[PDB]
């Protein structure tokens, strides 16, 4: 009695945080698979989606 919001997403268990991906935001974010070769320092932070 008193739930503000419920919802559906990716199970933070089958997709473990250690050996594979990560989910703190909604998007399942992995580190370095497709990094844009030649840009500034703050870029590529979206190509990790």
């Amino acid at each position: 009695y008193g739930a503000a919001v419920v919802n559906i997403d990716l199970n933070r268990d089958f997709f473990d945080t250690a050996t594979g991906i990560d989910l703190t935001k909604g998007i399942p974010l992995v580190q370095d698979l497709l990094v844009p070769i030649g840009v500034t320092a703050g870029a590529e932070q979206s190509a990790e989606y």
């Binding site: 070769i37 030649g38 500034t40 320092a41």
Partner: protein, 35 residues
Amino acid sequence: KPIIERQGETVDGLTIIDTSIVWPILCQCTYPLVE
């Protein structure tokens, strides 16, 4: 007096173009690879 004319190599490296300067730039030359 012309602006371009025939002459042998000058006392400076501008005449006689070396053509061997191709293999180093295909092997022994790291680029910024694209910081």
